[PDB]
Structure 1
Amino acid sequence: DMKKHLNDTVSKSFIGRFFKLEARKTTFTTELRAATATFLTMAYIITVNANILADSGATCSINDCSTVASSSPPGPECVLGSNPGYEQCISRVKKDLVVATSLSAMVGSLAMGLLANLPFGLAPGMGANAYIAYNVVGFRGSGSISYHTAMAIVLLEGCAFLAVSALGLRGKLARLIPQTVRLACAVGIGMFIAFVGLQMNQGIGLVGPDKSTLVTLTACAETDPVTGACLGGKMKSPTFWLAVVGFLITSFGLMKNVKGSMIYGIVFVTAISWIRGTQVTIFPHTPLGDSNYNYFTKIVDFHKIQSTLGAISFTEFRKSEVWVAFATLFYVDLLGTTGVLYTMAEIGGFVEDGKFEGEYAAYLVDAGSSVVGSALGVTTTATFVESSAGLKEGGKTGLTAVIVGLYFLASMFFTPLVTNVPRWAVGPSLVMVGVMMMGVVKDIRWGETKEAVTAFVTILLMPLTYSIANGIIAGIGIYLALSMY
C-alpha cells in the first residue's frame, strides 16, 4: 500500500487540483511510467540532430582556419577538411550543439506541459533540420545561403506561423491542399532522409560516385583521406559491417516491442567503437584524437554556450533564392502539424465531435517554441509522433511533458558521452526513421492515374535530385497542369 498513499497525497496536493488528477482516471505512477517510456523512445534525437547540424557549415568559416606554408588559405581547401583549426572549430561547435538541442527540447516541452494539459513532447524533429542542413546551408559552407540567414528564416517562419495560428486561419488554410500531395511529400522526405545516411560523407558509406553511371555501390576500404574515393576493395570496410550489425540490433528491437530501440543500437555501436587501438576506433592517435580522448576522460561536464549563441543577421532578405526556402519551410511545417497532432489525439481519450479542448494552446505552443530555437542555433520543432508509448500506457495530463523536460535536464550534463558518437552509428537511425516515414504509402489512392502520377513524381524527384523543394514544386505543377479546366 506504499504506492497508494503516495498517489493520494499527490492527488490531494495542489498539483493534483491544478492538473485535475481525479478526473481522466490516472495516478502519478502511471504518468511517470508513460513519461519514461516516451523519453526512452524519443531520446535518439539529442545526438542525431546535433550530428546532422554539426556538419552543416556552422558559424565556423574560412576566417578560423590555421596557418599553412602559403600566405592565406583560400576557400575550398579549409571547408573540405584536413586542417587542424577548422577541425577544432567543428569539434567545439558539435560540443555546443548538443546543449543547444537539449535546451530547445526543454523549452517547448515545458510549455506544452504547463500552458496546455496534454501529454506530448517537443524537440527539433527530422525534416526541417534535414532540409536546412544539406539543402540551404549545404555541406560545410556550400550552397548560396550562409548559416546566419538560415536561422533568420526559421525565426521569420516561426513568427509567421504564430501569427497565422493565433487568429484562426490555419484551419481553413491546410484543408484546401490536395490529399495525395501531403502523403507524397511525407514519403519523399523520409526517402531523402534515408538516402542521406548512406553517402560516404555523413553516413555509413554505402553509396558514392562513378563516371559512366551516377551512383555505384562503393562500400570500399582503401578510402582516400582527402576526398573519400577508394583505390581498391569492395564490401570489406571494417566500419560498414559494424554499422550493419548495429542496424540489425535496432531492427530486432521493433518486433517483440522493446521500450526503446534506436538508442540501444546507437549506444552499442558507440561503446564498441570507443575502444582505443582497433581499426574501427573513433579516437585515432592524431592530435585531434588525443584532444578528444583528453576531453572524454571526464564523463560529466557543464558546457556553456559560446559559439552559436543567439546571433541573427537580418541583412540578406534583399535577394532571391531565400524567400523560396521560407515558403517551402512554411509548407513543410503546415503539412506536418496539421496531421500529426490530430492523429495523435485519437489514441488518447481526448477527441470529441468537433473540438479537442486544448487545440488552440497546443498549436500556439508548437509555433511559439520556434523563435526560441531560432535564437539558439537549432531549427523548428514539432509534436513527436513517436510519443505513442505514453498514450498507449497511460497518463492524460501534463505529467508527461514536465517529466520529459526534467529528464532532458539530465541529458546535457553528459555532453562528453554525446559528442564522441561516431558518424557511422547515426546511419542506422536515419534509415529506420526513413522506413517509419515511408510506412504510410499504403494510404495513397493508387487507383486513379491523376493521384498516382503526382505521388510517384513527388516521391521520386526528392532523393534523386537531392533537394526537398524540387519534389514539392514538381508535384504541385503536375497537379495544377493535369486539372486545367
Structure 2
Amino acid sequence: KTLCKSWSDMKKHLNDTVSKSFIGRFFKLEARKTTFTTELRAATATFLTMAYIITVNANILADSGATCSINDCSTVASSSPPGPECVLGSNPGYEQCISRVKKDLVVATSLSAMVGSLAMGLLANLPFGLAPGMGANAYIAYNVVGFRGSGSISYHTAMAIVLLEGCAFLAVSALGLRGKLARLIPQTVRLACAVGIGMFIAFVGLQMNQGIGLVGPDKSTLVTLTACAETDPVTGACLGGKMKSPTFWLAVVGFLITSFGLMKNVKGSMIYGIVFVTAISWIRGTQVTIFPHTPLGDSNYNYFTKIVDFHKIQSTLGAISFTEFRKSEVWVAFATLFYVDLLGTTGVLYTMAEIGGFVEDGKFEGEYAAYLVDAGSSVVGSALGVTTTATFVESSAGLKEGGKTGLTAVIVGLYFLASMFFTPLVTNVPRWAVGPSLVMVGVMMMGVVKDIRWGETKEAVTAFVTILLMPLTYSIANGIIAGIGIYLALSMYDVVLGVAKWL
C-alpha cells in the first residue's frame, strides 16, 4: 500500500487538466469519450507495429538500384558493365553506394510518414497511420526497373511516374467520386481485402531476400524449405545443410518472446523481439553477426561508433526527368498502376471507418478532406524518394484499446521524428530481425475472418479466391480484380432481370 495510490496521484491530475483546455475542445476530448491516458495506450502500441517500413522499404528500393549507375559502379578496372549493370556485389563504388542509399531511403521513409500522419490528423481528427505502403514497391522496382537495373525503364523516370501519379489522384480527391465509389465496392470483397493484406505481408517475411529465409526456389514445385547454412551469395540455391542455419534459430526465439509477451498483456512487446535479436547480432565474433571482417562491414563500425547523427539528405531528393516519357512503353506502365492504385488502396481506408464505428449513416465525419492528405503526401514523398502512400491497414491495433478521436496520428508522427535522430540504430538491423514482425502483423489480421457471412455461397466463393490469389501471385492488384470479376459474373442474372424490368 505504498506505491499503489502514490503512483495514481499524477494520473488523475493529468487527464483532467488536459481535457478542459483549448486542445481539449479542438480535438474534442469531452464527447466521444476517450481520454489522454488511453490515447497514449492506443498510439504507442500502434507505432511499434509499423516499425518494419523503416527497414523493408529501403531494403526493397536499394535492390532496384536507385542511383550510382555504371558511372559509379564501374570505377576500378572495367568500363563495360559487369553483366547487367554491376550485378555482382564485389564491386567497389557499389559497396558504399548501397550503404548510402540505405541511409538516404531510411531518412526519406522517416520524414515522409512524419507529415503523412500529422497533416491528416490535424485536419479532421482522424486516428489512422498513413505511410508509404507495400502495394507499390513489389511492382515499381521489380517489374519496371528490375533487379539492379534489369529493365528498360530508368529509375529517374520511375520517380517521375510515381510523382505524376499522386498529382492525378489529387484531382479525383477534389472531385469526391473516389469516396462515393467506396460505397459501391462489394461488402465481401472489402472484408477480404484486409485478410489478403495480412497473408501477403506474412509471406514476404519468409524469404532470403528480406525475411527469415524459409521458402526457396525449386525445379518442379517452385517452393521448398531451404533454410540451410551453406547458401548461394546471390540467390536462395542451397549448397547443402537442410535447416542447420542459425539465422532461423535466432529469429525463432525472438518470435517466441514476442508471442509470450502478448500473452500476458505487456504494454509493448513488439520491440522486445526486435531488441533481443539486434543486441545479439550486434556482438562481434559470432557467426550470426551483421559485422563481418570484410571492408564492407568494417566501414559500418566506423560509422556505428557514432550513435546520433542528423544526416542531411544528399542524393535522392528529386531525380525527376521527363526524358523517357516521349515513347509508349512508359504510359503502359503508368496506366497499369493508375486504375490499380485507387482500386487497391481506397477499400482499406474506408474499411477502418466501419471498424471504429465512425459511420453513422453510411458516411463518416470528415470524409471529403480525409482523402486530400492521402493524395497530397504521395506527391511530396515521390519527389523526396519514396513511392506512394498507400494508407496502411494497421491502425486496427490502435482502434482496439480506445483510439477514437484525433491527435493519435500526430503523436505517432512525433515518434516518427524521434526515430530519425537515431539513424545509426535503424540502418544497422539485420534482415532476419524485422522478419517476425511481418508474420506478427499477419496473424494479428486474422480477426476480420469471423465477420464474413460464410453461410451462403455467393459471398463465400469470392472471399476464398481473393484470399488465395494475392499471396500466391505476389501481387496486390490481382486479388481485388479477381474478386470483382468473380462476383460480377455470379450476379449476372440479377442485373439482367433488374434491367429487364427497366423497360
TM-score relative to the length of structure 1: 0.86
Question: How far, CA to CA, are the matches of 2:194 and 2:340 in structure 1?
Answer: 9
Conservation of the 8 A alpha-carbon contact between 2:344 and 2:476: no
CA 1:281–1:366: 2 relative to 1, 3 Å: same
1:338-388 alpha-carbon deviations (Å, 9 max, x no partner): 444444335556432354222222221222211111111112224444334
What is the rounded CA distance, in whole Å, between the counterparts of 1:455 and 1:396 in structure 2? 29
Contact 1:174/1:334 (8 A) holds in 2? no
Cα distance, 1:290 vs structure 2: 0.8
Q: CA 1:250 to 1:379, structure 2 compared with 1: closer, same or farther past 3 Å?
A: farther
The residue matched to 2:351 in structure 1 has which SS?
helix
Deviations 1:271-298 (A, max 9, x none): 1111111000001000111101111111
Structure 2: tracts of 5 or more residues without a match: 1-8, 494-503
Identical aligned residues as a percent = 100
1:299-320 deviation line (CA, Å, top 9, x unaligned): 1111111121122233344555
Distance 1:132 1:227 in 2: 21
Q: 1:391 to 1:482 in 2, by over 3 A?
A: closer
- Map Cα deviations across residues 172-205 of structure 1 (whole Å, 9 max, x no partner): 3234444454455554454444333322233222
Change (3 A) 1:445 1:327: farther
Range 193-202 or range 22-31, more displaced: 22-31
Distance 1:23 1:199, change over 3 A: closer
Give 1:243 shift: 2.1
Bigger mean CA deviation after superposition, 52-61 or 295-304 = 52-61
CA distance in 1 between counterparts of 2:38 and 2:456 reads 47
How far does residue 163 in structure 1 lie from its aligned partner after superposition? 1.5
Of residues 183-192 and 77-86 in structure 1, the stretch that sits farther from structure 2 once superposed is 183-192
Measure how far apart 1:169 and its partner are.
Answer: 1.1
Using a 3 Å threshold, how does the CA distance of structure 1 residues 304 and 483 change in structure 2: closer, same or farther? same
**1:480 shift after superposition:** 5.6
2:342 counterpart (334, 355, 377): 334
CA drift at 1:20: 4.0
> Residue 257 of structure 1 aligns with which residue?
265
SS at match of 1:123: coil
After superposing the two structures, state which structure 1 stretch, 132-141 or 373-382, moved more. 132-141
| Alpha-carbon separation, structure 2, partners of 1:319 and 1:181 | 36
Aligned to 1:452: 460
Instruction: Tell me which moved more, 53-62 or 21-30.
Output: 21-30
- The CA distance in 2 between the partners of 1:180 and 1:20, in whole Å, is 34
Alignment map for 1:15-414 (pairs within 5 Å): 15-76=23-84, 78-183=86-191, 186-320=194-328, 322-323=330-331, 325-327=333-335, 329-331=337-339, 333-335=341-343, 337-346=345-354, 348=356, 350-388=358-396, 390-394=398-402, 396-414=404-422
- Do the aligned partners of 2:348 and 2:391 also contact (CA within 8 Å) in 1? yes
Aligned residues of 1:62 and 1:79 also touching (Cα < 8 A):
no
- Figure out how many residues of one structure are paired with residues of the other and give that number: 485
**2: distance between equivalents of 1:445 and 1:394?**
27
Q: Deviations over 1:60-104 (max 9, x none)?
A: 333321445444334426134222321211111011111111110
Q: Report the Cα offset of residue 252 of structure 1.
A: 3.0
**CA gap 1:449/1:355 in 2 versus in 1, 3 angstroms:** closer
Secondary structure of the equivalent of 2:262? coil
Contact map agreement 2:303 2:424 (CA 8 A) in 1: yes
In 2, Cα distance between equivalents of 1:12 and 1:474: 51
Equivalent-residue separation in structure 1 for 2:471 and 2:49 (angstroms): 27
**2:136/2:388 contact within 8 Å kept:** yes
**2:182·2:350 contact (CA, 8 Å) conserved in 1?**
no
Q: Secondary structure at the match of 1:45?
A: helix
Q: Post-superposition shift, 1:421?
A: 0.7
Quickly say closer, same or farther: Cα 1:217–1:11, change in 2 above 3 A. Answer: closer
1:105-144 Cα distance to aligned partner (Å, 9 max, x none) = 1112221222222333322233333443444433332345
Q: Classify 1:151/1:190 alpha carbon distance in 2 versus 1 (closer, same or farther; 3 Å).
A: farther
Q: Could you tell me how far apart the structure 1 residues matched to 2:185 and 2:284 are? A: 54
Report which stretch shifted further, 326-335 or 285-294. Answer: 326-335
Structure 2 CA distance, aligned partners of 1:150 and 1:161?
A: 17
Give the drift of 1:155. 2.3
Task: Provide the TM-score with structure 2 as the length reference.
Answer: 0.84
CA positional deviation for 1:160 = 2.5
Q: Is the 8 A contact 1:137 1:144 kept in 2?
A: yes
Please, which runs of 5 or more residues in structure 1 have no aligned partner?
A: none
Q: Measure, in 2, the Cα distance between the counterparts of 1:439 and 1:17.
A: 34
Deviates more, 1:116-125 or 1:277-286: 116-125
C-alpha spacing 1:394/1:435, structure 2 compared with 1 (3 Å): closer
Secondary structure at the aligned position of 2:216 is classed as strand
**Structure-1 separation of matches of 2:305 and 2:240:** 37
Query: Does structure 1 retain, via aligned residues, the 8 Å contact 2:212–2:431?
Result: yes
Q: 1:44 to 1:141 in 2, by over 3 A?
A: same
* CA pair 359-482 structure 1, distance change in 2 beyond 3 A: closer
Contact 1:165 1:364 in 2 (8 A): yes
SS at match of 2:79: coil
1:23 Cα offset (Å): 4.1
More displaced, 2-11 or 83-92?
2-11
Closer, same or farther: CA 411–280 of 1 in aligned 2, 3 Å: same
**Post-superposition CA distance 1:432-476 (Å, at most 9, x none):** 333444654555566666565555554444444444445555555
Structure 1 range deviating more: 386-395 or 293-302 = 386-395
Tell me how far 1:164 sits from its aligned partner.
1.3
**Cα 1:325–1:222, aligned 2, differ >3 Å: closer, same or farther?**
same
The structure-2 alpha-carbon separation of the partners of 1:404 and 1:245, relative to structure 1 and needing over 3 Å to count, comes to same
Provide closer, same or farther for how the CA distance between residues 439 and 82 of structure 1 changes in structure 2, counting only shifts above 3 A: farther
Q: Secondary structure at the match of 2:224?
A: strand
